[PDB]
Ligand binder design. Structure first.
Ligand SMILES: *[C@@H]1O[C@H](CO[C@@H]2O[C@@H](C)[C@@H](O)[C@@H](O)[C@@H]2O)[C@@H](O[C@@H]2O[C@H](CO)[C@@H](O[C@@H]3O[C@H](CO)[C@@H](O)[C@H](O)[C@@H]3O)[C@H](O)[C@H]2NC(C)=O)[C@H](O)[C@H]1NC(C)=O
Ligand SMILES: *[C@@H]1O[C@H](CO)[C@@H](O[C@@H]2O[C@H](CO)[C@@H](O[C@@H]3O[C@H](CO)[C@@H](O)[C@H](O)[C@H]3NC(C)=O)[C@H](O)[C@H]2NC(C)=O)[C@H](O)[C@H]1NC(C)=O
Ligand SMILES: *[C@@H]1O[C@H](CO)[C@@H](O[C@@H]2O[C@H](CO)[C@@H](O[C@@H]3O[C@H](CO)[C@@H](O)[C@H](O)[C@H]3NC(C)=O)[C@H](O)[C@H]2NC(C)=O)[C@H](O)[C@H]1NC(C)=O
Ligand SMILES: *[C@@H]1O[C@H](CO)[C@@H](O[C@@H]2O[C@H](CO)[C@@H](O[C@@H]3O[C@H](CO)[C@@H](O)[C@H](O)[C@H]3NC(C)=O)[C@H](O)[C@H]2NC(C)=O)[C@H](O)[C@H]1NC(C)=O
Ligand SMILES: *[C@@H]1O[C@H](CO)[C@@H](O[C@@H]2O[C@H](CO)[C@@H](O)[C@H](O)[C@H]2NC(C)=O)[C@H](O)[C@H]1NC(C)=O
Ligand SMILES: *[C@@H]1O[C@H](CO)[C@@H](O[C@@H]2O[C@H](CO)[C@@H](O)[C@H](O)[C@H]2NC(C)=O)[C@H](O)[C@H]1NC(C)=O
Ligand SMILES: *[C@@H]1O[C@H](CO)[C@@H](O[C@@H]2O[C@H](CO)[C@@H](O)[C@H](O)[C@H]2NC(C)=O)[C@H](O)[C@H]1NC(C)=O
Ligand SMILES: *[C@@H]1O[C@H](CO)[C@@H](O[C@@H]2O[C@H](CO)[C@@H](O)[C@H](O)[C@H]2NC(C)=O)[C@H](O)[C@H]1NC(C)=O
Ligand SMILES: *[C@@H]1O[C@H](CO)[C@@H](O[C@@H]2O[C@H](CO)[C@@H](O)[C@H](O)[C@H]2NC(C)=O)[C@H](O)[C@H]1NC(C)=O
Ligand code: NAG
Ligand code: CA
Ligand code: CA
Ligand code: CA
Ligand code: CA
Ligand code: ZN
Ligand code: ZN
Lengths: 535, 274, 242, 242
């Protein structure tokens, strides 16, 4: 589906304008979409500085782009309701040079178009293009493509699909709007000769005996084992025992020796391209509560020698022994190495150790709040429609307390998951400006794949706004101070706002696919940051 | 029409007579000064349509001085804008005649004055609702009626006014007078009311072609389309002569505004049209 | 409130002209104001002798200055009734690149402007400036500033202030016209790199056992005690037992 | 005690080399002294980049500097024990055109020199310079000065002071090695026209009713009192009810 003519290629970074007819929510969502391109491809963007060809993003009627670089510079429309990252990513792929997937030359080998079900005067949007207009980039037809069309596209009757896959399983998959597909990224890379990406700095699942070029300290007391998932009941997080002889992870036994013995696992040197990074990883602390996993940086001391230790975050044992997720904000602007110390604590009271797998290091903010829900498939069966779970209260960078309500079974539709944000009262509220005028919620159901290019994390975006109101609060703003306007919960000793978000954030039959429930449990990321500065 | 460079030497000569004729028609307000030719377009002697960018001099039109005899206003006092005009010059008969005009003027931006000089007297919307302007002009007149008693005088009309508040209220005024019928002079004056003591000052100085003038408020719209006719519409200038030479003339629709614009008499953006 | 651009600075002494349209009183008061600059700062003034930039002082309409050095040379007006030293000092501070205090970028944090009480067409006199045009010279907003407007500045109603301090006590103090404030001198010194001043040659309050580098003779008979104010009823003049 | 000739004045930042013969302790002590200069004056330092004059700091014999900017660039030495911050500061004040305080022209009004108690061969280290060579910077002689020598300097007998203050209290004070004195900063600032320290960004003690240009929010519920230190136990920290 790529436009064949190489004169239609951009040259990076794509210079852009956000037109002030865009809502703040759209401006923030566009920048967030640019971050996903930079995190999965060598595509990059920059503010406009007088260049010949550029993208101006605007809020016109509907949501659309011209295909490829138009050398005079070009519009993208993100009409109201198109804010969600996948729609923005779809239209930016049009500007990068990609036509719709069901417009491939060979499409008819892979899909059925039920022409008589299309609205009259829309059937031309389903035209197929010849091989002189378009390349396949030597890739198969991809039903998972973000460039594909949903079954119910331009259709007369809401019960009847326009388009269905010839392999009937993919009827349930065509026109996903999670993210870029794996093949969409491969095509984008093949079009623009990408190999790296600007915002994945490192990742490691320990799969090779090379341990991703990590090393071990010798000034420490002992070593982490590069441990095989073949031992009974001790599975790594990458494969979870799904494959014999192939799951690998680092393990630091605390069951023997003295207290306060330690091992350093230490990365290969990294050359950060941004001032901030998020070190994601998965870990277990099955050993004594007094065991410590301490994350460190070793950074350039400014002589070009990477020897300056900086303790960044300490993870401590809890009653839970299942795989936890960690995110550590690093703030490295000079070359460095991320380090894990494990500290033995009371081996006379440890039957276990510290474990690491599925490390990822992105040059991004960290998710501002992270919620895991355990045994989520068992929860999803046990829960009645319109029952809820609530996250513990996160704080944003500005000190607003917030949370998420998960309704595992939507009362609004069968087989859908509802997920909604709320502000929570918290220790800072008294000084914060109220209502929450322009903070931009991004909620993401994490796809648990270490490699960020293998991730299709579902995400939805809104900006807390003055327009958000209810008669339940006397038609006042939902984002006013939660002690005034929310409802009390002894469940965390908080007030919580009326919640806002999405009935059917994702269907169950979508959520069961990919790595969204990898260890039979659900992971939700929340960000909630001010976007007033985009105005 | 032959569009004429704004620095064309015959146009530069024509502009000074056209401006003098514009002042000659004006029977109230202040003598205008050329800042710079900004348009000149010629029908074929020679008939010119013009745009002149212009300032205000310190002389009222009832004063007998020619515009070349007078000075420019100080930055904070400034009024400026555009005069659009229609004027003819016959080289054999040495004829110099404005037919018509429209002039739009503004004071200098009261913000940009305050940005340049904070205590500079900011100009006032001219009306009788400013009771302190009436008090200033009547006090300065009353002072002059005590400084001299060989004659006595009455306030005819307040023309230009500004005020300032650095010592308490300070007001500055210009106004026409007649004796205690037609005016006899223009007087400047001031009133400064400190809490413990007034201060008063005064000066007294003593003394057509169809068009329009407007002093608009600050932060140049103008109209002069004497015909819509693409073939042109008739005019006559044959009354200028002692003998019946055939000197009917044509006006076409007003021409819209590389040797342009002309060099400014004052280049400051405080007194410069866009 | 200082004009940031360092091209707008003077180089001392400021060359000046007193025009003859100034009354004798105004000429004399301007020289007295220079003696205050020369006494409280390294600012100095000289009679004009052919310099490219200079100040000419004139009795025009009202009392005003362009801000900072205009390199062609510039007018200060001192109109009738503006003879008092503090008004001259305020205008000379404008020529020395200062704006009014209530025109600081941050002023809204320190003063209320009652816009509806300002006379029509006089709202601009209360325009603030951004931090690109002006430095704070790393100094707080100073209500006691000579540049600060009086509470009743450009007001519609003589009973009602245009401008009031958000710290209500300073309603009574904003637009003092005694003298330079301590912070106005601090800002003038930070602007013009002053440390000494031309006309304060010494001072001493004895608060330091060094006694201001005073010494005691030995061809005299005895010594003055450096007497401590602790003894009852026998205090110093600097602090008067405070 | 400052060298009068203005050519001898540095132009900031003073470019510096640290020689590799310096220990780490001496290199780090030098950079720590620079932080004190930057913190208490407009004196600034930069690494060397080929400039005509510069300081090179050295671990040569003894701890010494040429006085003022030698326009070829100059050695300073920092021998053993001169790693102390105040001794670096003293040598950098020599580099910044300052002579010892007991070498002032008027020093004999303030300190006795016991020539008889000086080691033979070292009396010249108590020479005093005439006022054509040095300014007073209109400052008193300062016993608290970092440029002053302690009582036991160059002495024959360890128990017997070479130099003593004529005000006898100051025998317990002269030649302090704490820091710059307030007059050493006053001098340094008069010498280099420094009005603002590079690193003192703000300070406040609330002694003034404008509370150092702090403000109180309105989003909050309430306000902090600006409290008068008058109540029985509730004193300020600046003055402790003194
Ligand atoms: C020894 O360590 C156990 C827990 O660690 C586990 O057992 C060891 C023997 C080894 O097998 C380790 O590898 C393994 O991880 C400690 O037991 C824990 O004690 C705490 C404090 O009393 C208990 O916390 C409370 O838990 C309740 C909920 O049950 C909460 O309401 C409370 O707020 C509080 O958090 C915790 O339940 C308990 N955990 C278990 C699994 O027993 C034990 O204290 C420790 N002994 C010593 C001497 O340190
Ligand atoms: C990704 O890699 C591609 C190769 O795999 C690049 O394609 C090559 O780009 C060259 C220009 O940079 C082309 O050269 C030009 O070719 C045309 C005919 O196609 C000639 O008329 C031109 O004269 C010639 N240019 C010059 C200066 O002579 C190569 O032909 C072309 N190769 C192929 C196989 O198409 C892509 O450009 C590259 N993409 C990016 C974004 O860098
Ligand atoms: C008060 O002291 C200041 C230092 O603390 C002086 O500021 C320095 O003035 C220098 C000129 O005398 C400036 O040098 C010029 O800088 C500009 C860029 O800003 C360059 O284009 C010029 O090339 C350069 N001049 C030359 C000859 O190369 C310094 O930049 C400037 N330093 C700082 C930190 O501002 C003030 O001039 C002084 N002011 C007064 C009123 O005394
Ligand atoms: C600290 O501020 C001082 C003013 O308070 C500055 O002193 C002025 O320096 C000028 C040179 O930069 C001197 O100009 C010279 O004057 C003599 C006559 O006195 C002439 O022969 C010279 O030709 C002339 N030089 C030039 C280039 O024109 C000023 O006379 C002098 N003023 C005073 C009162 O001393 C200091 O320079 C300044 N020092 C630093 C380090 O910032
Ligand atoms: C983007 O679309 C807009 C909306 O059509 C274009 O804006 C105006 O479009 C009409 C028709 O082309 C023109 O008459 C106006 O002059 C256009 N104004 C501007 C500011 O462009 C716009 O041209 C389109 N393209 C770009 C690159 O902005
Ligand atoms: C949309 O498609 C559905 C499925 O074919 C149609 O559903 C039928 O609706 C009628 C009543 O209108 C019922 O009698 C049939 O039993 C329904 N069939 C099924 C299989 O449920 C529906 O009518 C279509 N609507 C339109 C407007 O075409
Ligand atoms: C200071 O103000 C006077 C006000 O009179 C300015 O002088 C007038 O300037 C204009 C333009 O140059 C002339 O047309 C007048 O003839 C001048 N009048 C007088 C009495 O000289 C003067 O230009 C202003 N600026 C300076 C630096 O003096
Ligand atoms: C000027 O301000 C004063 C004070 O606010 C006004 O005084 C009020 O006048 C009315 C009668 O006109 C009285 O009923 C009120 O009691 C007065 N208020 C006070 C606080 O004394 C005055 O009217 C205003 N005048 C104008 C012209 O604005
Ligand atoms: C250093 O000076 C002290 C004081 O002048 C000398 O001490 C005295 O020495 C005599 C003998 O010569 C004793 O009788 C005294 O009792 C000492 N006085 C004190 C205060 O102890 C000392 O001798 C000198 N030493 C040198 C090496 O010069
Ligand atoms: C999850 O399932 C396991 C059995 O596989 C059970 O032991 C455990 O208690 C469950 N945990 C939760 C949080 O429900
Ligand atoms: Ca693994
Ligand atoms: Ca090890
Ligand atoms: Ca004595
Ligand atoms: Ca408050
Ligand atoms: Zn599309
Ligand atoms: Zn002023």
């Amino acid at each position: 589906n790529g436009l064949r003519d190489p004169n239609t290629r951009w040259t990076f970074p794509i210079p852009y304008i956000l037109a002030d007819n865009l809502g703040l929510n759209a401006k923030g969502a566009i920048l967030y979409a640019f971050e996903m391109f930079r995190l999965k491809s060598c595509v990059d963007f920059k503010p406009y500085e007088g260049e010949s060809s550029y993208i101006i993003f605007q809020q016109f009627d509907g949501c659309w782009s011209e295909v490829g670089d138009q050398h005079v510079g070009q519009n993208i429309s993100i009409g109201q309701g198109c804010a969600y990252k996948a729609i923005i990513e779809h239209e930016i792929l049009h500007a990068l040079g990609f036509y719709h997937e069901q417009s491939r030359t060979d499409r008819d080998d892979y899909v059925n178009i039920w022409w008589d079900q299309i609205l009259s005067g829309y059937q031309h949007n389903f035209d197929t293009y010849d091989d002189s207009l378009i390349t396949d980039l030597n890739t198969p037809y991809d039903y998972e493509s973000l460039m594909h069309y949903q079954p119910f596209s331009f259709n007369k009757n809401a019960s009847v699909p326009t388009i269905t896959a010839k392999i009937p399983e993919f009827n349930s998959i065509i026109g996903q709007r999670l993210d870029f597909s794996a093949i969409d990224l491969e095509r984008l890379n093949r079009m623009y000769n990408c190999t790296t990406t600007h915002t994945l700095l490192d990742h490691c699942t320990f799969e090779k005996a090379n341990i991703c070029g990590m090393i071990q300290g010798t000034r420490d007391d002992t070593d982490w084992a590069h441990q095989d998932s073949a031992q009974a009941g001790e599975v790594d997080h990458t494969l979870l025992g799904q494959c014999t002889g192939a799951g690998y992870f680092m393990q630091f036994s605390t069951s023997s020796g003295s207290a306060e013995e330690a091992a350093l696992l230490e990365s290969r040197i990294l050359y950060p391209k941004r001032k901030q990074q998020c070190l994601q990883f998965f870990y277990k602390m099955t050993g004594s509560p007094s065991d410590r996993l301490v994350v460190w940086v070793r950074r350039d001391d400014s002589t070009g020698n990477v020897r300056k230790l900086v303790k960044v975050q300490t993870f401590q044992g809890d009653d839970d022994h299942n795989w936890k997720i960690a995110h550590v904000v690093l703030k490295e602007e000079q070359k460095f190495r991320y380090l894990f110390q494990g500290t033995k604590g009371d081996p006379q009271n440890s039957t276990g150790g510290i474990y690491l797998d599925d490390i990822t290091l992105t040059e991004t903010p960290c998710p501002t709040g992270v919620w895991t829900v355990r045994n989520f498939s068992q929860v999803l069966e046990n829960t009645s429609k319109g029952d809820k779970l609530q996250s513990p209260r996160f704080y944003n960078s500005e000190g607003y307390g917030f949370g998420v309500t998960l309704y595992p079974n939507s009362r609004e539709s069968s087989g859908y998951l509802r997920l909604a944000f709320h502000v929570c009262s918290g220790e800072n509220d008294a000084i914060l400006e109220w209502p929450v005028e322009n903070r931009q919620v991004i909620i993401t159901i994490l796809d648990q794949e270490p490699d960020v290019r293998n991730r299709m994390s579902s995400s939805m975006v809104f900006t807390t706004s003055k327009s958000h109101t209810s008669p339940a609060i006397n038609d006042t703003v939902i984002w006013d101070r939660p002690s005034r306007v929310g409802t009390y919960h002894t469940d965390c000793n908080c007030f919580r706002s009326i919640d806002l978000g999405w009935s059917g954030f994702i269907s169950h039959q979508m959520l069961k696919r990919r790595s969204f429930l990898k260890n039979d449990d659900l992971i939700i990321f929340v960000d909630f940051e001010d976007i007033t500065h985009l105005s | 029409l032959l569009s004429r460079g704004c620095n064309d030497s015959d146009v530069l000569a024509v502009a000074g007579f056209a401006l003098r004729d514009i002042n000659k028609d004006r029977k109230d307000g202040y003598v205008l000064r050329l800042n710079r030719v900004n348009d000149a377009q010629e029908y074929r002697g020679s008939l010119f349509y013009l745009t002149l960018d212009v300032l205000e001099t310190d002389c009222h039109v009832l004063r007998k001085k020619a515009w070349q005899d007078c000075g420019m206003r100080i930055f904070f006092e400034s009024v400026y804008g555009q005069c659009k005009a229609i004027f003819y010059m016959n080289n054999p008969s040495r004829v110099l005649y404005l037919a018509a005009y429209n002039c739009t003027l503004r004071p200098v931006s009261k913000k940009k004055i305050y940005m340049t000089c904070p205590d500079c007297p900011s100009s006032i919307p001219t009306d009788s609702s400013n009771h302190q302007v009436l008090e200033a002009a009547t006090e300065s007149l009353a002072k002059y009626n005590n400084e001299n008693t060989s004659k006595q005088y009455s306030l005819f009309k307040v023309t230009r006014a500004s005020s300032q508040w650095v010592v308490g209220p300070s007001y500055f005024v210009e106004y026409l007078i007649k004796e205690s019928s037609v005016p006899v002079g223009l007087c400047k004056g001031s009133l400064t009311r400190t809490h413990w003591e007034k201060f008063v000052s005064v000066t007294c100085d003593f003394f057509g072609p169809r068009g329009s003038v407007q002093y608009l408020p600050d932060l140049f719209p103008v109209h002069l389309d004497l015909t819509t006719n693409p073939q042109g519409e008739t005019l006559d200038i044959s009354f200028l002569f002692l003998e019946p030479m055939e000197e009917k003339l044509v006006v076409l629709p007003f021409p819209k505004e590389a040797e342009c614009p002309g060099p400014a008499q004052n280049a400051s953006p405080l007194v410069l049209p866009p």
